[PDB]
Amino acid sequence: MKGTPSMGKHNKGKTHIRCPRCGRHSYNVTKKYCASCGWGRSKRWRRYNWAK
Amino acid sequence: VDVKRLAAEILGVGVSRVKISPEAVGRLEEVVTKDDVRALIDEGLIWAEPEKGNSRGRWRELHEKKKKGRRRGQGSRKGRRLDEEEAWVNKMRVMRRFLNTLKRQGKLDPATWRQLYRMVKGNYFRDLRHLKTYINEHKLTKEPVK
Amino acid sequence: PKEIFLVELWKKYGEKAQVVRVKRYEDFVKLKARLSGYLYTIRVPPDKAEQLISELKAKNVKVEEV
Amino acid sequence: GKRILVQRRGRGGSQFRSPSWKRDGPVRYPPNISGRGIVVEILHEPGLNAPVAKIRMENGVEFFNYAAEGLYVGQVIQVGPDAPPAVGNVLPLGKIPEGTMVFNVEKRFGDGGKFARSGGTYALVIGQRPEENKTIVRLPSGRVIEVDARGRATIGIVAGGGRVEKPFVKAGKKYHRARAKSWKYPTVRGKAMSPYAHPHGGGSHQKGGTPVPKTAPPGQKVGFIGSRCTGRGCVRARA
Amino acid sequence: PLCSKWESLITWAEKGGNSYKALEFREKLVECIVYTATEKVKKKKLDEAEELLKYGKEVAKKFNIEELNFHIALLEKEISKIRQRRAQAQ
Amino acid sequence: MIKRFVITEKALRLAERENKITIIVERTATKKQIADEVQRLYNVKVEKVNTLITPRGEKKAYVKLAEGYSAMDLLTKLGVL
Amino acid sequence: PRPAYRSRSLRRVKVKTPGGRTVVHYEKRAKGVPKCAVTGQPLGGMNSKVYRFGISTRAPSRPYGGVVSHKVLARAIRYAVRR
Amino acid sequence: KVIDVGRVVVKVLGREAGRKAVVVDIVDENYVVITGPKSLSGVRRRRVNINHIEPTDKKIEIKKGASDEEVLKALEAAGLVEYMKERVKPKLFEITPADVK
RNA sequence: CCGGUCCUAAGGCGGGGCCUAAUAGGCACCCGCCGAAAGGGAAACGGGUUAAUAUUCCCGUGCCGCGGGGGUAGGUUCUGCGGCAACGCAGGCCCCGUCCCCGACGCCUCGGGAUAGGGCGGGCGGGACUGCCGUCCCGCUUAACCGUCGAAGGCCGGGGAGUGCCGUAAUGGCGAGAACCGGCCGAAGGCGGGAAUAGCCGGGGGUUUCCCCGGUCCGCCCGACUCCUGGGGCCCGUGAAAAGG
RNA sequence: CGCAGGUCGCAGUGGCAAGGGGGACCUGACUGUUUAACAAAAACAUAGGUCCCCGCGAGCCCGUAAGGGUGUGUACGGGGGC
Ligand SMILES: [Mg+2]
Ligand SMILES: [Mg+2]
Ligand SMILES: [Mg+2]
Ligand SMILES: [Mg+2]
Ligand SMILES: [Mg+2]
Ligand SMILES: [Mg+2]
Ligand SMILES: [Mg+2]
Ligand SMILES: [Mg+2]
Ligand SMILES: [Mg+2]
Ligand SMILES: [Mg+2]
Ligand SMILES: [Mg+2]
Ligand SMILES: [Mg+2]
Ligand SMILES: [Mg+2]
Ligand SMILES: [Mg+2]
Ligand SMILES: [Mg+2]
Ligand SMILES: [Mg+2]
Ligand SMILES: [Mg+2]
Ligand SMILES: [Mg+2]
Ligand SMILES: [Mg+2]
Ligand SMILES: [Mg+2]
Ligand SMILES: [Mg+2]
Ligand SMILES: [Mg+2]
Ligand SMILES: [Mg+2]
Ligand SMILES: [Zn+2]
């Protein structure tokens, strides 16, 4: 059931929406910050040295 | 445009009952508005077939037979029809309102009313005729009850 | 819309009516006063009906047959 | 992972926590109640172990108290030093006659009551030491302790006794009681586990554990925890 | 009777000199009789309806209301046709 | 505020039949602002304003003129007809 | 809208329109009537069915009105007379 | 008998509940005629059911069928015209459903 | 006037504070806010119209909140009037406070009342079939809103009952006040108004959707899974809060 | 719901719909849960029994700390084993 049938449950939910600050589809509507730029939990832009 | 889609909403019927006359094949391609479908419906080139209602002649014939007692034997029964709980409600109401009327008018004393009222609750009497027969036989009241 | 049964009470409403509508039947006539808020209707005998239309026309209230 | 269930309980996850929003409030003595009051309500509280009484004080303060047995709606109770030792009255431990049956005893004054708070439980006032302002009472476990004489207790025994006498006949009955409490229901035996999950889990014939010392660290402190003894002989040694 | 609450209100209103409220109470009294009687005839409970209509005749005499008399005459006419058709089929 | 007029088939039928002029305004213009702009710009009287935001992201306003003014007359006077 | 009609918070009423159709209207259930502050029973003269809030309900002509029933009021007055 | 002519009573039911009045007549066992003067206490002169009044411990001297002005002189003789002006204040918080069962 | 928007739930975020080498890390504390398009919660229904919107446009008939004007009851030191009572009735105006209630609540079970829907007989109109019979089918509708009525249940007054007496589907009830009599409060829903002028059926005239004519009925029956009401039982299970009123 | 009479077939709950039954041993009391994708079990849970740590400033657990869960609780209780 973990394959194709469970894929049909991904039609109506959402974890992220568009971030106002960076415009990416990375704003976590439950945690209330952006997973890309960190908006909502950090006023400084989130960027790490391990990522190119 | 689809004329049957427009015509069904004008006529207030399903699209499966809308009929376009084959003589009006030429005028179909010219129709643009619902006013053009209204012109054709007035001319009789678009109408609606009357809907089907299931005929009840066989049922109405069969229902008279069932009232006379046909087609209700053991081989035609598959589940419960008579309501055992519902029968008890009518049995108490018939016997209680009969006994209560008799005592209310005075033909049965409250003492003798009590024993019959409890006998009714105790399932002594099969039906109203049995109760009337008991009341007439034992002379529980001055004048016989019909 | 509201219904009133006493002609004395209905005359207070019908006199202020923008328009009085009339609907006629055999045994009665429906008089309907159209005010700004509500539509007041009374059912009166036919003989009473032509009488009520008469003064209402004398009160300059518009009377329109529906 | 590898952390055992008793270690996961301390994180305060939702399946280990008390649903205290289902109750109207704590059953505690307000610190500044005295005079006369009226029993206005007697209520069932989800998750609690006794019926709860609502008291409308004369001045107007309303508080919650565990209902003594025999307490009824519309009863008049006395609170304060000048109250008599009648059932349902709230008095200081100093003014209670010895040999009296009390419940909701305050260890120190003002904490709201700590001991004898379950249905059918009571505390017995054993003695008085007014020089040091302590009252010697026997707790429901049988332990004899000293409490502040200025502290407050209620007269009588807690209503609702015999509740645990009736069996929890089905697993479903204990399921519904668990949802108003904080217990995780149900519980898996340690030896039914794998060795990553419990110290007892593992072998082809799974076994329980011998007792662990009192100094054992968390994750190892399961089973018998520094127990004085075990089995029927431990019960005999206690007596 | 069914509309006795409206009768007492009219005499109380007139006693206190409230001509406006007495008229409003007079209208409510006629409404209580005609509406309840007209519903009974529609359900064809003529025995209940005629008891109300007989009471309405007394009230119009007791209060000088012609509109009760006009509306009661309409309801009695309907009762005649209902009873007439019942006799024909039965 | 006004961006342009709508002279489509639906908008023209509305002008002749319901005394309504259809306009495209700024997306942030409210009904109070649209009625004020129409009255000031053209010297007419507005009865009510019905507004919608189109699927392409514009705001469209159905302005119904009061009953002394011609919706088609204002269209033909402006020369946008 | 739609799942707000799949819940039983509103009343599903079927009605036949003058146009011949049958439609389902969703109406509110009535609000609870005022209760006495002692016994909790409904108060006479104020227990008619009301379906929206903000509607004035005229209390009975008595001291304390729609707060306590006549039984609680009369008995309390008796206690105050002796007290 | 407690409910007797010249007895101050507090009406407990109706619109005039809690107000003070004086019995001036006796209709029968079930009824008496009260009048604490309507200018004074707020009670009109009419019959009252004896179950709808609460007798007080204060009583005055007036004959049967006493007029309303007679009761006024009697109560001012007793200096009770101010007592007839107060209204009784109930304490509903002390009442429980056991009292009215 | 359909939803969001408002409220709070389980929860969450931010500031202050405390902690931290430090923060973009933690939160017991204080303060504020967010948190439901299925919970709570103001007020619109029927008809018509488009190629595509339709409780939104148009027609008709209304409702809610906020504010204003007139009239009226009332008030103008002071209190509204009636009834034994339950309670009824236009019940003055402005500001502030306190308290109470509504909001506000499970599961099972059985009585009662309705409505949607469905059927039978007759009538009128229209349609189906042509071996025989003459049957079969369709239309005959009535929204929100205003008024009146109100089953259960509760209550009031009289009455004063034990040889008892009054009952239920069932358990039952009574000097801790029954039978019995009279009254007050009180549903879904009914009926009238809306409203036949609409819509539908049938028969016609014109022409781009308009106009004319007739009918739109009589007597019954079943009846919900929809709506209302009450009785009984179960819980070591008790079945939210707040805005608002 | 019943009774009487007549009557046709191979067949009348005529299609549709719609239990094969019984004896005995092992085993888990039972309803319940389980290896999404080879295991549904005799495995897990269970009600019941019993033992241990604990009088609350407890016992056990989480956190670097501030502090937190059990706890709006109190031995007819919380936690931990079998
Ligand atoms: Mg998620
Ligand atoms: Mg057959
Ligand atoms: Mg049975
Ligand atoms: Mg839990
Ligand atoms: Mg294993
Ligand atoms: Mg080890
Ligand atoms: Mg290990
Ligand atoms: Mg091992
Ligand atoms: Mg909009
Ligand atoms: Mg909602
Ligand atoms: Mg609700
Ligand atoms: Mg919110
Ligand atoms: Mg569409
Ligand atoms: Mg027919
Ligand atoms: Mg039964
Ligand atoms: Mg088969
Ligand atoms: Mg098993
Ligand atoms: Mg199984
Ligand atoms: Mg598998
Ligand atoms: Mg398998
Ligand atoms: Mg096992
Ligand atoms: Mg065993
Ligand atoms: Mg062992
Ligand atoms: Zn971002």
Quote the distance between the C-alpha of residue E19 and its chain's center: 22
Extract the runs of DSSP E, i.e. beta strands, from chain D. 35-43, 52-57, 62-66, 76-79, 90-92, 101-103, 123-129, 134-138, 144-148, 152-155
Q: Quickly count: other Cβ atoms within 10 Å of residue B79's Cβ.
A: 4
3-class state of residue G6 by DSSP: helix
CB A36 within 8 A of CB A26: yes
Q: Which amino acid is at H3?
A: I
Tell if the CB–CB gap between E23 and C45 is shorter than 8 Å.
no
Biggest CA–CA distance in chain B, Å, is 94
Separation between the CA of C55 and the C1’ of I200 (whole angstroms): 40
Contact positions of strand J to protein Cβ (< 7 A) = 1-3, 12-14, 30-31, 36-37, 43-57, 59-62, 68-82
The structure was resolved to a resolution in Å of 2.5
C-alpha to C-alpha distances, D74 to D38, D53, D59, F27, nearest whole angstrom: 6, 11, 17, 67
Tell if the CB–CB gap between D74 and H99 is shorter than 8 Å.
yes
CA distance D74 to D84: 18
CB D89 within 8 A of CB D78: yes
Residues in chain G: 83
* Helix ranges (DSSP H) in D121-217: 171-180
Cis (ω within 30 of 0) for the bond into D186? yes
Residue D20 approaches strand J within 7 Å at CB: yes
First to last CA, chain B: 79
CA distance D239 to D226: 20
Q: Give the sheet arrangement for strand C29-34, strand by strand.
A: C2-3, C39-44, C29-34, C19-24, C62-65
CA distance D109 to D92: 9
The distance of E90 to chain C (nearest Cα, Å) reads: 29
Q: Which residues of chain H neighbour G72 with C-beta distances below 8 Å? A: 92, 95, 99-100
Q: Given CB atoms, is G76 within the 8 Å cutoff of chain H? A: yes
Q: Strand pairing partners for D105?
A: D115
> Which amino acid residue lies closest to nucleotide J73, measuring CA to C1'?
D48
Contact positions of strand I to protein Cβ (< 7 A) = 2-3, 9-14, 23-25, 37-43, 45-52, 55-58, 61-65, 72-73, 79-91, 99-105, 110-112, 115-117, 119-121, 126-127, 135-150, 153-159, 163-171, 183-201, 205-210, 218-220, 224, 226-229, 235-240, 244-245
Which of D43, D46, D69, D65 is CA-nearest to residue D56? D65
Q: Strand pairing partners for D134?
A: D129, D148
Phi and psi of D217, rounded to 5°? -80, 165
CA distance B109 to B115: 10
Tell if the CB–CB gap between E30 and C5 is shorter than 8 Å.
yes
Separation between the CA of H24 and the C1’ of I91 (whole angstroms): 31
CA distance H41 to H72: 11
Which of D153, D54, D149, D146 is CA-nearest to residue D103? D153
CB F64 within 8 A of CB F48: yes
SS3 assignment for chain B: CCHHHHHHHHHCCCHHHEEECHHHHHHHCCCCCHHHHHHHHHHCCEEECCCCCCCCHHHHHHHHHHHHCCCCCHHHCCCCCCCHHHHHHHHHHHHHHHHHHHHHHCCCCHHHHHHHHHHHHCCCCCCHHHHHHHHHHCCCCCCCCC
Residues in chain H: 101
Tell if the CB–CB gap between H97 and G39 is shorter than 8 Å.
yes
CA distance D54 to D37: 10
User: Tokens 């890309």, residue?
Assistant: A36
CA distance H37 to D8: 79
Biggest CA–CA distance in chain H, Å, is 42
C-alpha to C-alpha distances, F70 to A6, F16, F31, nearest whole angstrom: 61, 9, 20
Residue G38 approaches strand I within 7 Å at CB: no
3-state helix, strand, coil in chain H (%, to 5): 20, 25, 55
Structure tokens at F37: 């702009």
Which of D41, D73, D45, D79 is CA-nearest to residue D59? D79
Eight-state DSSP code of residue D143? -
Q: Which amino acid is at B112?
A: T
DSSP G22-59: EEEEEEEPPBPPPB-SSS-PBPTTS-S-B-SSS---PP
Phi and psi of D148, rounded to 5°? -65, 130
DSSP G49-61: -B-SSS---PPPS
C-alpha to C-alpha distances, B73 to B58, B59, B64, B69, B78, nearest whole angstrom: 20, 18, 16, 9, 11
Structure tokens at H16: 């005039």
CA distance H2 to D215: 83
How was this entry determined? cryo-EM
Closest alpha carbon within chain E to C8 = E23
CA distance D79 to C22: 79
- Distant-in-sequence, close-in-space partners of D195: CB < 8 Å, separation ≥ 6: D201, D202
Q: Given CB atoms, is H13 within the 8 Å cutoff of chain G? A: yes
The distance of C27 to chain E (nearest Cα, Å) reads: 8
Nearest nt by C1' to B109 Cα? I165
Closest alpha carbon within chain G to H93 = G38
Q: Which residues of chain H neighbour G77 with C-beta distances below 8 Å? A: 10, 12, 17-18, 54, 88, 90
Residue A47 approaches strand I within 7 Å at CB: yes
CB H18 within 8 A of CB H61: no
Separation between the CA of D198 and the C1’ of J61 (whole angstroms): 15
> What separation in Å is there between the alpha carbon of D207 and the centre of ligand 5?
13
Which of D42, D138, D159 is CA-nearest to residue D96? D138
CA distance G77 to H92: 9
Which of E40, E46, E15, E9 is CA-nearest to residue E27? E9
Quote the distance between the C-alpha of residue D216 and its chain's center: 28
CA distance H48 to H30: 9
Eight-state DSSP code of residue D158? B
> Which amino acid residue lies closest to nucleotide J60, measuring CA to C1'?
D6
Residue B91, exposed/middle/buried by CB under 10 A (0-12, 13-18, 19+)?
middle
Touch between chain H and chain D: 3 or more Cβ pairs under 8 Å: yes
**What is the β-pairing status of strands D123-129 and F20-25?**
unpaired
Phi and psi of D53, rounded to 5°? -105, 140
